[model samples]
Target: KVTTVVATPGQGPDRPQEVSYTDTKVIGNGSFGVVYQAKLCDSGELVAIKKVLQDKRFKNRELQIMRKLDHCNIVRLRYFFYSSDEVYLNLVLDYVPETVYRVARHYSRAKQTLPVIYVKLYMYQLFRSLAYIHSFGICHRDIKPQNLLLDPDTAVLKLCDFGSAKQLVRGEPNVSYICSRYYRAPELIFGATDYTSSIDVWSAGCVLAELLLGQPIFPGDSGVDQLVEIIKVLGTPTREQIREMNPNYTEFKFPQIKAHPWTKVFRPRTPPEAIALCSRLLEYTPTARLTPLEACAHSFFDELRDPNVKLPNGRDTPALFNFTTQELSSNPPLATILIPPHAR
Candidate 1:
């Protein structure tokens, strides 16, 4: 069965072109909308068609943000079109067969943990994607394993789902009650409407910790319980830390708990560098967290930068160092470390 539509290019001019696809089947369904997996008739390539109800009252924010993004580590938006009645917005995206969530679950079910190298590879790509979007002042607002698409064979990770994303403007208020529960940052818990892109950093950190521990680092039953779980590991926030998170928050009555040492947070075989990176990212003060680019340069990912590194399947690693001038323009100094000598 072939279906074709007049769609606009995700990037570039608004030239409506014919797009044809076949074998359409529902791949995902949720509160947002339904996603269909389809094969493009022209290229025979698999594509994901995300169909969402178009509210005539407002422009689709996801379409706008996805259009602006063009990075290898991020999902590519091929094309989009409106239904004849203009009641639905359809997004054509690259169809990656696996997600980090499912991959990790596979390992967990087998009574094993994700290989440390795979963890490094996936997390590094995630940081790269974050660096790209955060560079544009866009806060993903949602960063979790399920949102991380993975290619099991190549180990390439792509960050997906921009439904909760927004271009954060300083002094502009945003909803604090965003992001998933397991990965919610401390600032969000404090109800800080004026937050920074660092919330994504915190979410990324939770993902890293989950990879290492084989379970969520902060698993809370409710919003308040979420803070309790974080405090159990990170300990109680100091007066200064609380003020830094949200100056307007004055209710500071809680038991003082000492931080659980980083070394004890993971398994005995866990790399110290991994623990070090986690400690830097999960800080209570948002500003204290490491920027995405800085995380990419950390020693935990140094093995990825090695010229000899290969996937466990012996395939060469994905294109990790193809830094565009726009990406490097954010931090020129880091270019020296981001792009290895061989890649340069």
Candidate 2:
């Protein structure tokens, strides 16, 4: 059976075209909305339809942000439409079958660790996606493994789920209670309303740490507990560090602890460069954290720059150096480091 609806292209003008699809089935559902997997009639391609109730008074921020975004490492918003009664908004997106969370879990369940090379590939793509969006002043409040969609065959990673994303304007106050608990930035846990895109960097650091450890690095039961977990690994934040996070946070009494050596935080086999990169990302001071592009250029991902690199299955590495002029415009010097000689 097939169903058709007039849908608007995500990046183009408001002209609504007829879109038909079949073989619909529920893929996932959450408090945000329901997602259905369907095969498009024209291309016979699988697409995920994210259906959410439309709020009568406002535009969908997710739709607006997704329309303006075009990046290989970010999920593509193909089309969108509303129900006849205008009660629901349906976003049609590229359907990737697996997520980084599931992939990591698979390795963990098998009593094995995710290959270090795979970690580099996935995390590099994630950083690329973050750099793209951050350059546009958009902040992805949530950057956990679940939102990192994966194409298992090609090993391509795409960042998804823009529901909590926002175009963070300077001097604007944002909600502090955003982002998932395990991956939440220290500044966010401290209740900072004025934060930067570095929050996502902190979350990405958590992701990298979890992939390296085969479990969450900062597993906590509550907000305060989360801070304690972070303290265990990072040591106690100084008063200056707290000031940098949120100057307004006054109750600063806490036990003093020394910083944990980066080497001891991960397994002995972990590369020193990887530990070094993780340290830069999980910094307590927001500005001290490495920018997404800077993280992408770190030596930890140097292996990915080699032209001879291949996946564990012997397939060529995914397109890691396909940086558009817009992506490289933010930092010209890094372009030389990002795209190796052979890739050019």
Clashes of each: 0, 0
Model 1 regions lying over 4 Å from their true place: 84-86, 247-249
User: For model 2, how does the per-residue alpha-carbon lDDT over 151-204 read when each residue is reduced to its tens digit?
Assistant: 888999999999999999888899988899999998888889999999999999
Please report, as a residue range, the 10-residue window in candidate 2 with the lowest summed lDDT: 247-256
Clashing pairs in 1: none
Model 1 alpha-carbon miss at residue 219, Å? 0.6
As a TM-score, model 2 comes out at: 0.97
Please provide, for model 1 over 1-344, each residue's C-alpha lDDT reduced to its tens digit, 9 standing for 90 to 100: 78989999898688999999999999998788899999988999999999999888999889989999999999999999887555889999999979999988888888778889999999999999999998889999999999999887778899998889999998889998899999998988888999999999999999999999888999999977898999999999888999889944556457999999889889999999999999999999999999999999999999998899998888999999998877765688999998888998
The C-alpha TM-scores of every prediction are: 0.96, 0.97
Write down the lDDT of every candidate, Cα atoms only.
0.91, 0.91
Which residue runs does candidate 2 get wrong by more than 4 Å? 84-86
RMSD of each: 1.4, 1.4
